[PDB]
Design a protein around this ligand. Sequence first.
Ligand code: ADP
Ligand code: ADP
Ligand code: CL
Ligand code: CL
Lengths: 526, 526
Amino acid sequence: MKSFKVALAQFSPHIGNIDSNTQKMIEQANQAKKQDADLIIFPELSVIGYPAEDLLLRPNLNKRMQKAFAQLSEVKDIVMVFGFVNQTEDGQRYNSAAVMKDGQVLGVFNKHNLPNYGVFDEKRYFQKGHQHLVFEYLGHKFGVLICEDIWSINTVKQLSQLNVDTVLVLNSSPYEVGKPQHRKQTLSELAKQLHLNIVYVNQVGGQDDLIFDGTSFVSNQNGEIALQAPSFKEDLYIAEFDRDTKLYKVVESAPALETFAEIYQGLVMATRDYVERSGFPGVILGLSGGIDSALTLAIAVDAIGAERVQAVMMPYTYTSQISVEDAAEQARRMGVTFGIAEIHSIVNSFMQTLYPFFGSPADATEENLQARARGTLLMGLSNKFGNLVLSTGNKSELSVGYCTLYGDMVGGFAVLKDVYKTIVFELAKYRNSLSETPVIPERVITRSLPAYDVLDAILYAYIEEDLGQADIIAKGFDKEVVEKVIRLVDRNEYKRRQGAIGPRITSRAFSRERRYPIVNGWTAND
Amino acid sequence: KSFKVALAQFSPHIGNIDSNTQKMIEQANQAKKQDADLIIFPELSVIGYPAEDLLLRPNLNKRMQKAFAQLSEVKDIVMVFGFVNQTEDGQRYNSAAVMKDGQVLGVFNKHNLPNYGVFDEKRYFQKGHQHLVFEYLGHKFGVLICEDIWSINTVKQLSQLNVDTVLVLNSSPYEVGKPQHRKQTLSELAKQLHLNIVYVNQVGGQDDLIFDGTSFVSNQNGEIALQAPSFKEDLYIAEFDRDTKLYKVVESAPALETFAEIYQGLVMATRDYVERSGFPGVILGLSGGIDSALTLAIAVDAIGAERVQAVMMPYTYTSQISVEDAAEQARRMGVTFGIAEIHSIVNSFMQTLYPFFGNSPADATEENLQARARGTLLMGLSNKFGNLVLSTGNKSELSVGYCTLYGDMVGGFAVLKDVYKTIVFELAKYRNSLSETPVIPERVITRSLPAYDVLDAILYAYIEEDLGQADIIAKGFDKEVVEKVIRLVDRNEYKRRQGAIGPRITSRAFSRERRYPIVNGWTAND
Ligand SMILES: Nc1ncnc2c1ncn2[C@@H]1O[C@H](COP(=O)(O)OP(=O)(O)O)[C@@H](O)[C@H]1O
Ligand SMILES: Nc1ncnc2c1ncn2[C@@H]1O[C@H](COP(=O)(O)OP(=O)(O)O)[C@@H](O)[C@H]1O
Ligand SMILES: [Cl-]
Ligand SMILES: [Cl-]
C-alpha cells in the first residue's frame, strides 16, 4: 500500500468531436504527469462528450473509438480512466470506462444503471452492464462506476462486497440548484457507510439546454471530504493518498456558494459557452428598462465582456422616459454599446396595412405588433453584423404564455427561460451585491446549391439513410457539393428547433425522430 | 364453430380517458349489433398514443380503474383493449386486457418496448415476460402489442403454444410505403408460422405524427382476408369459417398510389390538428409558388374552403404573374383572398435600421425583412380573428436553412415540413389529377393572474412537483386561481416549443425534461 496522487480532470468536452476530446485528454494526462499524478480520471463518455444524442448511433462510431484508443495508447507513465462507447462483437453498445496504462487496456467497465428519465435517454443508445471492474495499483484496490451507478444502493453494495479501497466515479451529472452540495452530502455519508473512498469526477460546461457544474470531489472512507473542486470551472485537481493514514489528504476549500451565486455563475457559464462554441462575435439584446433584460445584460457582460455586448432600446408611445434612462444608465455603467431605435413608424405602417382586414376593438393584437417590430429590428442587426440575439423571457412568462411568438421570444439563446420571475429578482440583487455601485439600477429591482432533384437525393442519403459523407459521394455525387450540403444541414439544427410542428411522413423526421446536438462537433471524415 | 371479430380502427383523444372509454363502449355496442363475438382496439386505446409524460401522472392508475369499471358494464362481447397496467410494486406496463361481462379474463404486458426513432417506451414502462393465450369457442387466441409482432422470437413463442389467431394491438405511426409493407411482411409471417394475424392499428393525426390505420386480417395461408383503408376511423368485421379454418376473404379497393397515400395523410393530419385544437379556420400566405399552392389545396380538402383564408403579400419584385396565379387558385377553390402590400412596412424598417447599417452593403438582411413583415402581418390577422397560421416551408428548405426565422417559418402547423421539394411537385400533380379543372394552376407546377410570488409557488407545485390541482389547492391556494394557472400552462405547450433553447437550472425544465403532448385531453380532476 504505497502513497499516490489522483488527478481529477474537471473537463469540458466538445460534444461529438472525438479528435478534439482525445487531444485534450492527452494534454490533461501530460499536465497531470507534470504534477506527479499517478492516475487521471475523466468524466463519463469523455472521448465523445455528453449529451451526444443520436451521434451515438452513427455506424462509423466504433472505428473512431478505435482510433481514439490508438492515440491514447501513446500516453506513457500514468494510469488513465476515461469514458468511451464500448461496442462488442455482437454489435451491443455500452456506456463504458477504460483503465489504460502504457497502451494496455487493464480493464473495462460497462455502466449498469442507464437513466431513462427526465433529461436522460440512455436506453435509446446503450445496453446495460452486469460485471464490476476492480484493479490493484500501487497496493490500492480501485473500483470503477459510472454516474447513475453510484446512486444505486444495490450496485454500490456489490462493489463494496469486493472490499474496494477507492471507488472511481465518472460522471456527466447535469446541474440543478442545490445539487452540487447535495452530491457531496449524500456520497460522503455513503462513503462512511461502506468504509471506502469515493473519487467523484464530473463534466463541466454549458451544452445546448444543459449546464454541467463540475464540482468534483474526493470523499474519504470516514465520511470527510478531502478535496473540493469549484463549480463551473475547468481544471485538473490533485488528491493525495496517505499510505500511513489510509486517507486522502484534506485540502482546504472556500465555502460553498450561496444559492443565487451558484445559479448566477451557472447562467454566466452557459451563456459564454453557447456564444463561444457557436462562434458568435458577440451578443445583442433589447433593453426595456425592465428587470429581465437588465439581468440578462449583466449576465452577458459577465460572460463575454462589455466590448462584445450590444444593447438596443426600442421605445414606443407608452414607453416611459424613466425606462429609457435606466436602460441607458446601466449600459453606460457597464460599458456596453447602446442605441435607441423608435418603432412608432414601423408599427403605424403595420396598422395601416392591417386596417382593411380589421375594420374590431383594439386588443392584444396591437401590442403584439410592437413586440414583433422589436424582434424583427434585432434580427436585422443580427443578420447584418452577426451578434447572437439573447431573448429575455423568464420561466413564469413561458409557463403561462405571457410572451409573444416572434416578438419578445425572438432569440437564439434564452438565458432566463428556466428562471422563475421570483428568482430573477434574487439574481439581480445578488449581482448588485458584487459591486460598490450597483450595475443594475436599484429602482429597476423595485417597480449555390444544386437543383432540388440532386439536393433531395443527397439529403435523403444523409438524413433518412444516415449515411456518412464518403458513402454519399460513392453514390456518384460531387465531393464538394456533398460536403457543403452536410455542413448546411448540421449548421441549421438550431433553426429547425424553433419551427412549428408538422406531420411525419418519412422514415426520419427532423423533430422527435432525429436527435442531434445544436453545438455539434462530429467531424465529417470516417 | 364460426365467429366474428371486430377490428376497431379507432382514433383516441390523447389523454382523454373519459372520452376514449365512452367511444370504446360505443364501438363495442356497435360491434354487437353487427354480430361480432370479439372486438379489438388499438394499443393503449384507453389513453391513446403518444400520451408521453401523462403516462407518469400519479393519478393515472385511479383513472384506469374508473375506465375498467365503466368498461365492465359492456356485456355479451369479448373486448381486447390497451391500458396502462400498474402493479402493487408500482411498476407500469404497456398492456392489453381481455374482458367479458365485467370480468378480466387475462392481461398481457408488452414484451418489446421500442426506444428508437419516434418511440420512448422505456421512459414509461417495464417489459413483460409472459404470454396471454385464451380459448374462446374452440379457437386459441394469442395477444401481442405492436413491436411484439415484429420480434420473431416473441412470435415464435406463441407459435409453440399452438395459437390459432394472434390478436395484435398497434399504435403504428405512418410513413410512406409502410401501410402496404406491413401487410406483405405479416402475411408471410402468418404463412411461416401457420397462424392467423388480426392487426388493429390506431388512426388519426396527433401532434407531429400520423397514424394511418390500415388494419387487416391475414390468414394462416398467407392471404389477406380483410383490408381496412388508410386514414379512416371505422369498425371492420372479419368472419372465421369453421370448415375452412380461415377468415373469409373480403374484397377491397386497390391500394393507394404512393402520392395519393401521402396526400390523404397530410389532409387528415391537418384536419385533426385544426379540429382538436378547436380553431375556427386557417390562414396562410399565398406566394404564387408551389409550396403555398399545395398547402392551400390541402387546407381546403381538410376543413372546407369556407374556413380557409389566403393572403398575397407582394413587395417590389413580386411578379404580376405570381399575384394572378394566387388569385386564380383562391377563386377556383372558393377561398377568401386578400392582398396586403408590404412596401411601406419594409421601408419603415429600413429607415429605422439605416443609422446602424450605415453603408454596409445590402445582403440577405434586407430580404429577410420582407419575410418577417409577412409573418407579422399573418400573425396580426391570426391574433385578431383566431385562424391557425399554416406555414408552407418544406423539408428541403428546412434541411439547409433556406427559410427565415420569424418570417416564412411563422405558423402553428407546418403541413409540408417533412415533405421534400421533390415530393411537393408530385403531390401537386396528384391533386390536380383529381378534377377536370386543376386547382393549382399548371404554370405554378412549371416555373388576471396573481402576483409573481403566488404565481411562481403554484407553477412550482404544478411543474417541478408535478402535483395535481387538488393537491396544489390543499397547499392553501384558491381553487379557481389554480385551475386557471394549470389551464394556461397546458394551453401554451405549443408556444414554448417555438422558443429558443436556454439553460436548465431547475429539477424540471420545459425543454427535454418535461414531455407533454400539444393536443392534450387530460381532464383536470382525479
Ligand atoms: N394550439 C395552438 N397551436 C398552434 N398555434 C396556436 C395555438 N393556439 C394559439 N396559436 C397561435 O398563437 C397565437 C397566440 O400567441 P401570440 O401570437 O404570441 O399572442 P398572445 O400575446 O395573445 O398570446 C394565436 O393567434 C395563434 O396564431
Ligand atoms: N448556432 C446558432 N444558434 C442560435 N442562433 C443562431 C445560430 N446561428 C445563427 N443564428 C441566428 O440565426 C440567424 C440566421 O437565420 P435567419 O434570420 O433566418 O437568416 P438567413 O435566412 O439569412 O439564414 C443569424 O443572424 C443568428 O441571429
Ligand atoms: Cl445525476
Ligand atoms: Cl411500428
